Subunit: 334 residues, 4 copies
C-alpha cells in the first residue's frame, strides 16, 4: 500500500515536488489542486525557465495529467475543504499555496479527508518545524500538521548547528542574498501585502526585505533560540541564493577549524564546497544547503573574534528536495 | 478654469500621466482611484525603477496625496460607477486599469458623473481611436469615450502613414520587439488570462505574444485597413521597445527616399534619429515614436522590393505623452 | 573510432567536448588553447547558461581527464607544430577564428590531421555545409570545410523548405539573438569599433548586422541573392529565434507551410507546436527548431507575405550541428 | 581656473566630465583613451545606466566640443608620451585602473602634469581621501593622491560616526555591489585569472574580494586594523549598498545610531528613511546614503551586534566624491 500524496498549489515548489516524488519510492502523487485549468498546469510542469524541461512524459487527459503513464487527478477549487481528499483516500497533502501556512487552515485538508498535511513554508509556533538532517527525529507520526520551514531555514540550520555544537554561539546576524520570488512584482506596481519594496521591479533592484529564518531558528535548534536575527536582500537572479552568518563564538576558532567542522557534518542535505562557484552553479542542487569554505572568514581584533560563514542554496530545488525528504520520513512514522 | 482629470488605475501609465499632466498647462488631476491604500500610491509615484525619481514634492494627507502643494483625492473603489466624479466635477477620466477597455465598461465612469473618458488601451471598433499627430482631427468633441490605442500603435502609425502617403502600401508584416510588462509573470506561474507565454518568467525569456496594433491600424489609418498584421516578441528590458515593418510598396523606393520622407514627417510626436542608439536611449523620450534611419533597408530582387522600416518607442513614457496630447486636444473640444 | 582535436577551447569548443563525450564512435584526443588549463577546466565544469558538466573533469599534469580519459592540452599558436599525426587525429574543429581560410586551416593537415571543420564561415576556397541541408555536396576529397555561422544553421533548413516547396522571390530576416561575448558588459569602448555592441549587453535591445542572409547562396544556391537580414540582440545569455518575412513564387497557406516543415523534420531540424519561449530552447540538440505557432500567411488582394520563425540555441544547437558535420566529414 | 585631464574615458572618466562641467573653477582640457574620437563622443552622449547627457556634444577634428568648448582627444596608452606639458594641465584624473600606484602615476608628472588623482586605491604610500571625512590631511604639496574605492566612500562616513559616538572593537563588511566592467559578459577566460569574474556578470551572484575595509586606516586612522570585508556582485548595472556588522565599545540603541548618522549628514553623507531600492539610488550625488530602515541591534545577554547599511551609486556617488576631492585639492595646490 504505497503512500498517496496530493499537492495543493502547483507553484514552483509544488511542481518541483512532483518531479522529485516521481523518483521517490513508496510515494506517488494522486492529485494536484490549483486554481487554473489543467492545460496550463501541464505546460508549466513540462517547461521550466530556471529548472529545465521535465525529463519524462507529460500528457493531457480530460481533467487530469498523465505523468510517465500514470494519471493524476487535477482540481481547481480554491477552498481546501471542498477538495475530495477523502474520496481519494490521500495520506498527505503538500500545502504549497502560501495561503494556508497555519495549523487551523491546514486542518481544512483534514476536514476534506486528508490524513496529514505538510506545509511548504513556516507554519507558526503551534506546528512542528523540521529541517531534514537537523531535527527530523522530533517527528513521531502522530502530528496532523507539520512544517518544513523556510528555504533560508534549511540553508542556515545545518551551518548554525555545527557552529553551536563545536564552538558555541553567543549571537549572530544573518544576511541572505536571495533570488527574486513570486511575491515581488514584475514592474513597479501596488503590492497585495502592502510591502513598498516587494512592490518594486524584481529584476531591476537590490530589494531589502525582512526574513524570520534567524529568529525562528529556535524551533529547529533549541540551543540557538534567541541568539540570531536576520535580514534579506533580494537580487536579480531567477533562482539561486546564499546565506551569510556573522556570529560571535563562545570558544575561539580558526577558519580552517570551521571549514573542517562543516566538512565532517556534510550529508545528503549539507554539502561541502571548495571550488570558486557562483549562483548559477547552485541551480538544481539537491542539497538543502551547500557550505562554501572559500567564503569562511575569521577576524581577530585584540583577541576578539568575528566569524563569517556562508552557505549556498537553490531556494527552489534545495528546499524542494528537503521537503520531499521530510515527506518520506513523515510517511514512515505516519 | 482649467480642465479637470481623474485617473482610474495608478499603474505605470496612470502614474506617468500624472507627471506629464502637472507639466501641461490648462489640465490638472483632481483625483486618482486605485484599489490600493494611499501610502503605497504615494511611494510608487515618488520612486521609479525605470523612469527615475519624481521631480517634485509629493506628500500624504488623510485620504489624499498633495503633489506640488495641491491636494489630489484618493479613492480605493474597484467599481467605476461608485466613484464620485460628479461631486468632484471631473471633466475627463483616464481609464488606465486595463480592466475596463471597451465602450460599455468605460461608460460606468460617465454614470458616476464624468463627462468624458479616454481609454489607455484599444477599446475596439465602437469607440474612436486616435494617435496624436495622425488622426486627432477625427474628434469633434461629441464623443463620450475615446481610445488613445496601444503604445505599439502610436509607434507604427506615423511610420506607416508616411509609407502610405508617399509610396502606397500593398501589405505589411509587423514584428515589435517589446519590453516586458506587468501582464507577464515574474517567474513561471499560472496566468490569469490563460496565456501560456505571459505565464513565463518575464526577465528570462524571449516571449512571443500577440499584438493587434497591426490589424486595427485601420481605425487610425483607414487607407491601410486590412493591409497589415503583426506579432510581438517580449524581451528582458524593463522598458524601451522598437517596431519593425516589412512592407511591399506600390511605387519603387530607395532607402534614402524613405529616410527623407520620415524626416519631413517629423513632429513633436514623431522623431527622426540618425545615431546608433539602443533601447536604453529611448527611455524617457517624450516622442510617441522615434524613427531610426540607420535600420531602414530596401531589398530589390528582379525589381521586386521588400522594405524594412524601424522605429523606437518607450512603451511607458512615449505612450503616456501621446495619451496626454490626445487628452488636451479632446479637452479643448469636449 | 573518430579522433578529434579542438583548436580553441572557447564556448563552442567546450560544449563540443561535452557533446562528443556523449557521442559514440567519436572522442576528443586533444585540445590546444593558449589559456591556462586551470581556467579552461573551470569553464568546462561550470556553465551559467548550460549548467554543470555531467561527468568527471580533473586536471593531471599537462592534460585534463574527462570521464577517466586523458586529453592532451596544448598551447602552441602554430597548428603545424602540434602532433596531430602522432595522436592519430582525424578531424580538427577550428574554433579560434584565426585560421578561417583554406591555407591557414591546412596547417592542421600538415600537422597530420586528415580534415578540418571551421566553426565560422570560411572564405571563397572552402565549402560551406549545414548538416541536414547540403552535406551531400561533399565528395570526401576536401581537406577543409566550413560549418557556417550558428544563424545560418537556423535559417538554412527553414529557407530550403520554402524554396523547394513554394519558391522564394525575396526575403528579409530578423533574428532576435542572445547577447554575446563581443558585446560589452557595461558601456565602454569597443575593440571592433561597433557603437552598439559597445553598449551594455544585458540592458539593451541592440541592433546589429548579420551576414547569414547574404551568404545563404553557399548553402542553398537557388536562394542566392534572394535574402537580406539584420539582427536584434536582446538580454538573454543564450537562446534565439530567426524570423523570415518572404515573398513566395507560388501561393501558400499557413497549414501547408507548417506541414512542410514537419515533413522536413530530422535530427537537425525539429518541429514544435507547443507555446515555448527562449529558455525552453536552451540546450536543444536541433540545429533549428521550427515554430508552427508563429507561422502567419498574409493575403491582401491576392498578394501574399509570409512569416516563418525558427528557434535555435546559438551555443548548443550550433555545437550539435558542428558535431554532426564533424563525424560525417570524417567518414566519407 | 584649474585645468584637468582625464586619463581613461571609462564610466568614471565620462561621469567625471559631466560633473566637472557643472563645477566652477575647473575645466577638462583633454581626455586620453585608447579609442577613436568618434566612439568616445557616442559613449559620452548616451548612457544605459545614467541617461543621455544633458548638454551639447559635437565632434571636431581630433576633439570634442562639450557645451561649446573644445576638449583635445588623445589615444596614447603610455602616459609619459601624453602632451600634458604643452596643454599646461594642472591635474590628471587617472581613471583607467591600470596606473593605480604612485610609481605608475608619476608618468603623468613626467609628461608635464603637476598632480595626479587616482580614481581607485593607489596604495598606502599615497594620501587617500574620502571627502567629508579626511579631506583636511591634504596640504597641496602632494604629487599623487587617491580618492579611494567607491565602497570606501560609502563605508567611511558610516564607520566614522560609529567610531566617534560608540567606538568600534571590530567589524565585518559585506557590500552587495553592482557588476562592473572587469566581469565578463558571458563565461569566458578572465584577464587577471579570477575564476569568479570570469563568469557572466548578469546571470550570477559573484563573490569577490574587496580591500575597502582593511584600508580604512588610511581614511580613519582610529579604525586601522578593526575592519575587514568581502563583496557579493549581483546583476544590477549600477547601484550598491554596504552592510557593517560591528561590535561597539559602548552599548547602543538603533534610535541612537540613526540619530547619529542624521547629525553627520552633509553633501557627501545622506540620510534616508524611505523604503528605497537600488534603482532609487542611481544618479545620486551623495558619496554615501545611510538607510535608517536597515539599522538593527541584536542584544543577547547584554552582548551587542550592530548592523548599519548605506546605499551608494558606485558610478555617480564615487564620481561626485572624486570631483569634490579634486576641487579641494586644487584650492590647496
Ligand atoms: N520558491 C521558493 O523560493 C520557496 C522556498 C521556500 C518556501 N516557499 C514557500 O512556498 C509557498 C509558495 O511556493 P511558490 O513561491 O513556489 O508558489 P507560487 O508563487 O508559484 O504560487 C503558488 C501556487 O498556488 C496556487 N494557489 C494560490 N492560492 C490557491 C488556493 N487557494 N488553492 C489552490 N491553489 C492556490 C497558485 O495559483 C500557484 O500556482 C509559500 O508558502 C513560500 O513561502 C517558496
Ligand atoms: N505599460 C505599458 O507599456 C503600456 C503601454 C500602453 C498601454 N498600456 C495600457 O495601460 C493599461 C495598464 O497599463 P500598466 O501596464 O501600466 O498597468 P499596471 O500593471 O501598472 O496596473 C494597472 C493599475 O490598475 C490598478 N487596478 C486594477 N484593477 C483595478 C480596478 N478594478 N479599479 C481600479 N484600479 C485597478 C492596479 O492596482 C494598478 O495600479 C493596460 O490597459 C495597458 O494595455 C500600457
Ligand atoms: N565603475 C565603478 O563603479 C568604479 C567605482 C569606483 C572606482 N572605480 C575605478 O575607476 C577605474 C576604472 O573604472 P571604470 O569601470 O569606470 O573603467 P572602464 O572599465 O569603464 O574603462 C576605463 C577606460 O580606461 C581605458 N584605458 C585602459 N587602458 C588604458 C591606457 N593604458 N591608457 C588610457 N586609457 C586606457 C579603457 O579603454 C576605458 O575606456 C578603476 O580604477 C576602478 O576601480 C570604478
Ligand atoms: Na565518446
Ligand atoms: Na568648469
Amino acid at each position: 500500500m504505497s503512500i498517496k500524496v496530493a499537492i495543493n498549489g502547483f507553484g514552483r515548489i509544488g511542481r518541483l515536488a512532483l518531479r522529485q516524488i516521481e523518483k521517490a519510492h513508496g510515494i506517488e502523487v494522486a492529485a494536484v489542486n490549483d486554481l487554473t485549468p489543467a492545460e496550463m498546469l501541464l505546460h508549466l510542469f513540462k517547461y521550466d525557465s530556471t529548472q529545465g524541461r521535465f525529463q519524462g512524459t507529460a500528457e493531457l487527459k480530460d481533467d487530469a495529467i498523465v505523468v510517465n503513464g500514470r494519471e493524476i487527478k487535477v482540481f481547481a477549487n480554491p477552498n481546501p475543504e471542498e477538495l475530495p481528499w477523502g474520496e481519494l483516500g490521500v495520506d498527505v497533502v503538500l500545502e504549497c499555496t502560501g495561503f494556508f501556512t497555519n495549523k487551523t487552515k491546514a486542518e481544512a485538508h483534514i476536514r476534506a479527508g486528508a490524513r496529514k498535511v505538510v506545509i511548504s513554508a513556516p507554519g507558526g509556533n503551534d506546528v512542528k518545524t523540521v529541517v531534514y538532517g537537523v531535527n527530523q527525529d522530533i517527528l513521531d507520526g502522530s502530528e496532523t500538521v507539520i512544517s518544513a520551514a523556510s528555504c533560508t531555514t534549511n540553508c542556515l540550520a545545518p551551518m548554525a548547528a555545527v557552529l553551536q555544537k563545536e564552538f558555541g554561539v553567543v549571537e549572530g546576524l544573518m544576511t541572505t542574498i536571495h533570488a527574486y520570488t513570486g511575491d515581488q512584482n514584475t514592474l513597479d506596481a501596488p503590492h497585495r501585502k502592502g510591502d513598498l519594496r516587494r512592490a518594486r521591479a524584481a529584476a531591476l533592484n537590490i530589494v531589502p526585505n525582512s526574513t524570520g529564518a534567524a529568529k525562528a531558528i529556535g524551533l529547529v535548534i533549541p540551543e540557538l533560540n534567541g541568539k540570531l536575527d536576520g535580514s534579506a536582500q533580494r537580487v536579480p537572479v531567477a533562482t539561486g541564493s546564499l546565506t551569510e552568518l556573522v556570529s560571535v563564538l563562545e570558544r575561539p576558532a580558526t577558519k580552517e577549524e570551521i571549514n573542517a567542522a562543516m566538512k565532517a557534518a556534510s550529508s545528503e542535505s549539507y554539502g561541502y564546497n571548495e571550488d570558486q562557484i557562483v549562483s548559477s552553479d547552485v541551480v538544481g542542487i539537491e542539497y538543502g544547503s551547500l557550505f562554501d569554505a572559500t567564503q569562511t572568514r575569521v577576524m581577530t581584533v585584540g583577541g576578539k573574534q568575528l566569524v563569517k560563514t556562508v552557505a549556498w542554496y537553490d531556494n527552489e530545488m534545495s528546499y524542494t528536495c528537503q521537503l520531499v525528504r521530510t515527506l518520506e520520513y513523515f510517511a514512515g512514522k505516519i
